[model samples]
Target chain A: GVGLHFRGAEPWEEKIRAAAELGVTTVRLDATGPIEETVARIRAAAEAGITNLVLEPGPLALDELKAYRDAAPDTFLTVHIGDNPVLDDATIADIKAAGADAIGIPAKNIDDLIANLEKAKAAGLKVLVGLLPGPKELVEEKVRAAAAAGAAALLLDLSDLEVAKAAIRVADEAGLPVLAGGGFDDVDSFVAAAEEIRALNPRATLLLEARGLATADIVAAMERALE
Target chain B: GVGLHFRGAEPWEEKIRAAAELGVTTVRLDATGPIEETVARIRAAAEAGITNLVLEPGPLALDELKAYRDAAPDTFLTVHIGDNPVLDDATIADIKAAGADAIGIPAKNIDDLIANLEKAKAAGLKVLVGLLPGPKELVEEKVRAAAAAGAAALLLDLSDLEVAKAAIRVADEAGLPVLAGGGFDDVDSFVAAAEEIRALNPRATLLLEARGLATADIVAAMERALE
Candidate 1:
């Protein structure tokens, strides 16, 4: 599925419609501000039939997660463990109670990734390993380990092509689903990443991040990338 | 005293220090996010001795205001009635309950401004009228009416120089404190506004808004404005 990240700003409904029109089936928003506001945004996306939502609950409480879970029960929710990659027992229990389908953890170091994966697997949940931009050696190690650990999918940050290509090839070989995005600005970069990912792994999903791009521009990028 | 508006972002301690060095005695921050985060930031400013703090609670609850009020009881608090500038009975009551010293209302239309002023006054609280950029005629009318209505201070948006000039002159005549700021980027604009304001009202306060300028740039602008 093609996905676009959102920041919950103005003209949101329009942007959602734009993404929907562009065949973007998923959204990833960081739950930073008021839960009420974030919940409203999530509901908007759900109503638009873009139910594949990933929420990075940064500094928000467990209750906040429950609110979203309760509001959008049918929606497939992936909760990213922002900043803190090391997921403890209690945290995992709370996430389960909140009805999250998958736990998204950034592939930091080898030990942390393995530990998170093992814990999530123990809890009968899957861990979505996010490949952040770093040295080639470190990213390569994470990519290999994530594929081996029976992870849900690989989320690739498109900042570094060398790193992205390495991760994509490994995920493709392992038959793991891939989500590639971030650090993409223009249509060329977005198209380039999408095409490159398709060439490397035909089944890889193109997830365009709405970090700093204007809503219209991002919508256009999504349209171009999908084509 | 000169003041600088802050958004409670990173490198904050340095910005506070810069403001302090610029002889800034006050800071205005909108309490938009979590109460705990806002309270911590207010405390930081208080510790730095910028005790005059104004909080614009944009959809934040009364309890949030109470938290800040409790945390920094000694700091003078001015609560801006954002968006819904029309002050109602319960809102004024809540503001007083939260221990706010003054109510900040934008100089909207005549009826709204008069209504807000009357309500705040009846509640035994002061109202600080903000001069927003609008039609020349409307701004002039609001500015004149705000001065006549016994407002605490005039917070002028420097976006419109004509409106700002008109507001400053009226404020000077009324012996009300004027906070001239916003829509300033470069040193020249900052310096120009400061010089213009000083010439118009020698006793007027120069408030450099940290809207988009980087910490270092704003600090330098403040320094140059002071000179």
Candidate 2:
């Protein structure tokens, strides 16, 4: 799913419109709000045709996740476990039982990626692996590992374009879906990263991350690259 | 008294030789060692004619302070309370009883500075106020507050030369000694800050802070600045 990372800098209307206008499927947000406000925003995004809303409530309770899911039944919710994620069998089971469609697991190293992947797989919720950017070799290892583990999606922080392309190729070769994010400052870099993802796998995702790139000009450029 | 910050990166003998040759009175160090080794280094500095040894043991108990004191009686020991300093009546008294001639209190704001100063004063231990570098006005406020409270000395991180000079003038006007520190890379800035303090109060202290400036050239330049 193609998406944009939102930190509530732009109006919810603007982001939702951009997502809809550009054919972006998801809007990944760190859930920093009162429950009612968050629910309202999610509902608004869904009404505006955004199918996926990745909510990172930051190490929130399973009951809270259930609350979000129960409130916004129409929106596809992926809870990104923010810090030192608890991927134990019981917690994974609990997260799945909370009605989350998928879980976002941040990987530290290859061993950590493999361990969390196994736990996430056992719980039967679709797993999204968030790769911590490191050396090119490390990124390659993690991308391959995520693919081999049958992760539903791979998330990349598109800092180094070469690293992003190399990792994208690994995922594409394995037929895994990619959800790459960016804090890209320039139009050229953003276009290059988005183009790399699309060129590798047409069904893959692109998430615009930086607040500086929230202007209409950048958003329009993003639409052009998606084509 | 003028001093130099030591992190044990350079040879103790070299730092001692520099201090002695340059007539620097104090060598402040974070005590990160076995008791015996620390005591030996303190003794060595004293024998080399460096009068003051400021030891920051990072929130150590009073008994340990006494151990440091009992082990090295000849050295004028200033104990810097590393973090979240306990400035209650009993702790201050115990610190003084532990034979610390002076106490270092890091000030967050004016109120914290005043409160810690009053507590340090009640116990009769000489107070050394370490100012957390901030805006020019904030630095000026803390400097004046330290002066009014009769702090033994003011410790400044000489990041901004204008702020440092202004603070030095405040301490000098109050007839209070200033212990200024530098993380300065260039000889020009280091010499300027040191000269500013010396120009304001010839007996004021200057402490070299950066490890990058821990070379023979910088040490010699510091000696010239003192002159």
Candidate 3:
């Protein structure tokens, strides 16, 4: 089933809580404020029973890593890769030392993706390979290759539904989880992706932006969808 | 009489070394990293004899305001109001309480500029009103209005050489210090803006990408121009 994720400003906590009430199991929060404030916000979300907290730490020093780790000890922390290229090695080491459960690796090419997976494995971390949505063949090939290379999961950039299904097919064949991502704005997209991924019988599907669907409306929508 | 301001990554030591070696006296450093880091950088730059240090704070936060005050206690700090709209009255109050030297307001209209000036005056901070580049009338009206609102200086968003000269004319009429800004890539633009502002007897012409000029070998070319 597809797991929901939310991204945006921290001040939009009301929206975040609403999303959680909508039965979103996972939430990816973009940290824009100071490290202390970010951790505090995530802790608040967790207390509200929102598990699977993904922290996008941007250009943080080594000391900042400890603060994040201490704050969300139980929540899964997925460090974003695109922000600072120079601190890649340091981030990998710090996440490993801090015992971060999983790491999100955003790569441009096969070589970079493979290299990131190798680093993650060396650091004893589970890898979630991020693949941009494009041609079916390319997406399938990337998913298969990532699974073959021992990636714990594959996050298909959710730009197109057809492309996501094709990627999921490859993940199913390889017995790996397929996580859908990119431009997942509302409930229909999230449900559609979830249904499609469910048909594939993959381990998990990750949805960004859908998790922020507010509580009252999302709960009503989900009830209606279920009924 | 336009002051020569240099722009570079903070921890302003390296930038100051380069600017001093090149015979410049003023500079601007962004408040991006830790407040202590910002302070250390500014202190090093000030000790190296760089007189005007324009502090550009990133996000409006109480801690950020305090950090700026504590770091460069003696130096002038220029607050940027255009970027973060969350900078409401309380935020402005904190900044004022922290004792900021000046406020930089980017306005599209005369009313907006006046409103910013009113806020600055209410907080008892010096004002540097900046006009967005457009038709001659729009730019001129903004400058005149800002001068009437008791703005201490004028920051002309001189994205282009032609527009810069036009702004100089308006500032000249008001007899206010005209600070030139935007798209300052090379030594020629820098020299041109400096000369144009100086011709009108203004206090300073600021460069956002002055260090980029040095990085692109324009500094050496500037030396040649001087020779």
Candidate 4:
């Protein structure tokens, strides 16, 4: 299944609804928007038959995270680690205290990421290992180790379809669900990437920027492309 | 005499002690520095025989102004208007509300400065109009208008000594004190500008960035220049 990601709420609600209409199984929503509007949009998507919902909590403190969780316990909360990798211990403690179901850590190296995965697992949180596509051997090593370390999923920063296909193949053999993100711009590119990745029988694809393209004509284009 | 202007309190105290040792009488200090530290620095300056303490309160609320006044009752807390001219109202109101002695407004034009002076007068606040150096005609006009509007004093932006001389002539004719500011970079320049303005027979001169030059050997240079 393909999951649609929307950046901000109020402007993208219609597009998210349209994604639901086109059978998007999940939608990744950022947490800074009005909570009531986000909840309404997510509920609208669910009513329209989108089953999975991933919420990205943006720069939220522990109290904010608790409030969000209490308000929308049904949605899967995906926690982002840092804008900068070397966050202070106090901030790391706050993130850990947020008690997210899954943690996403942006990593520049395989060993550091694996270490982060171990830390997340020790904290009893499912991990989504995020990797930028680069050296083939390094990417493959990270994906394999993440799966071996029991990460919930592997998210590949697949800006290009070639990298997307390579990641799908790696995730397929490792027996891990593969989620594709980063620069998932238009409906044509998103559908092409999704089709290419799905051929490898990966569980789902995540689009980070596609829902930003959701508008009346664009939504129609997305529907046409998916069909 | 050469004066020092320090931004924050820790530096303010060090500079005050140094300036006093070098026989400097006045210092322009920012009120936005740490509250307790600023208060302590004010007391230290007063005890050291620092006569004129011009307090520039940057982005401070009225309550903050009141706190500063309560802390340093004897210090002459002059409110400074920065880039925003709308701040002139707040500066006047805060100065009056706190019962401070004088208000400072940075003037880009004669009319805007006249308005600032009128506001200060309405609020029963003494006004110090600050003029950035410009064309000879504009500088003279600013000084003329500040005098016409009944400003208590005028601070000339002496980035150009020629404009400062012209402003001094206007201030002398208008019977108002002319204080030099802006590019009073070193002891010699500060002393030269002050002498030039004083020769024109204004009440006093202000040295701002001039005192930044008051380092180990330069402190003696400033003392010699003032003497």
DockQ top scorer: 1
lDDT of 1 at A130: 90
Q: Which candidate is the best by TM-score?
A: 1
Ranking by TM-score: 1, 2, 3, 4
Q: lDDT of each prediction vs. the true structure?
A: 0.73, 0.71, 0.63, 0.64
Q: Which is the winner by TM-score between candidate 1 and candidate 4?
A: 1
Interface root-mean-square deviation, each candidate: 15.5, 21.5, 19.6, 25.8
Minimum summed lDDT over a 10-residue window in model 3 chain A is located at A1-10
How well is each residue in A136-218 modelled by candidate 1, as lDDT tens digits?
77787788899888788888875777678887887888898887776765555677778788989986877776654445456
lDDT by residue for model 3 over A101-210, one digit each (tens)?
A: 88878655677777778877887888877787678888878887788888887766658777777788878888887666676656555556666667775476556463
Runs in model 1 lying further than 4 Å from the true structure: A1-227, B1-9
DockQ for each of the predicted structures, in order?
Answer: 0.02, 0.01, 0.01, 0.01
Look at candidate 2 and give me any clashing residue pairs.
B2-B205
Q: Which docking category, incorrect, acceptable, medium or high, applies to candidate 3?
A: incorrect
| TM-score of chain A, model number 4 | 0.78
Position A162, candidate 2: lDDT: 78
Which digits, one per residue and each the tens of the lDDT, describe model 1 over residues B1-227?
A: 99997755544545665676667777777567666767887777777777677776567578887888876778788888765565669878988988889988876577888888898999999888887565567766777788887788887654557767877787677787876664444457667767778888875776655544567776677777665
What is chain B's TM-score across the candidates, in the order shown? 0.87, 0.84, 0.80, 0.82
Where in model 3 is the C-alpha error above 4 Å?
A: A1-227, B1-12, B21-23, B84-87, B206-208, B211-227
Relative to the true structure, candidate 3 reaches a TM of 0.46
Q: Ten residues in a row with the worst lDDT in model 2 chain B?
A: B209-218
